[PDB]
Design a protein around this ligand. Structure first.
Ligand SMILES: Nc1[nH]c(=O)nc2c1ncn2[C@H]1C[C@H](O)[C@@H](COP(=O)(O)OP(=O)(O)OP(=O)(O)O)O1
Ligand code: NA
Ligand code: NA
Length: 156
């Protein structure tokens, strides 16, 4: 039995495009990802997701809808990442680059899967179909999946 830490992940998904953020600095830079980070004490998971979206992309939203939950395990790390996945389509400002993140729109026939986390190829298609899901992925390093499960669910 392992302990888990709570994280959020936010996909700004509009009818023809998705907003992703490229990690600019540190280890892992170069990869495109949704926006998010660790949930803080006292805030709801949804409010943590809204906060990270604002801090990381500049976008504010009044509300997000929860679309999935994914547990990530990394070889050599005993703590699991419990990632709660949310989707916007409703935004009211422009994305802003920082020293840490560069946000960019991609058309939905140009989703940059090869430069995203490898798990995204599996669960993103469900998100695009407006389906909900639970997933688990075990990684060796940043690129190699050793085991995974993915299921569509009616309720997250
Ligand atoms: N395999 C994966 N697939 C994916 O789509 N997103 C992943 C992922 N692994 C991690 N992430 C996302 C989840 C979360 O949004 C982010 C990881 O959170 P961070 O470590 O950036 O959190 P914080 O910015 O709160 O951390 P601090 O450095 O403590 O401030 O990256
Ligand atoms: Na944070
Ligand atoms: Na983050």
């Amino acid at each position: 039995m392992k302990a888990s830490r709570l994280y959020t992940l936010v996909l700004v998904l509009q009818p023809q495009r998705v907003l992703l953020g490229m990690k600019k600095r540190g280890f892992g830079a170069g990869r495109w990802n949704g926006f998010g980070g660790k949930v803080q004490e006292g805030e709801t998971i949804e409010d943590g997701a809204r906060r990270e979206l604002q801090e990381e992309s500049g976008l504010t939203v009044d509300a997000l809808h929860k679309v999935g939950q994914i547990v990530f395990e990394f070889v050599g790390e005993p703590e699991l990442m419990d990632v709660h996945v949310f989707c916007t389509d409703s935004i009211q400002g422009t994305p802003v680059e920082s020293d840490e993140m560069r946000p960019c729109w991609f058309q939905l026939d140009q989703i940059p899967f090869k430069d995203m986390w490898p798990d995204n190829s599996y669960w993103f298609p469900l998100l695009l179909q407006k389906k909900k899901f639970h997933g688990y992925f075990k990684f060796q390093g940043q690129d190699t999946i050793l085991d995974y499960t993915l299921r569509e669910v009616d309720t997250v």
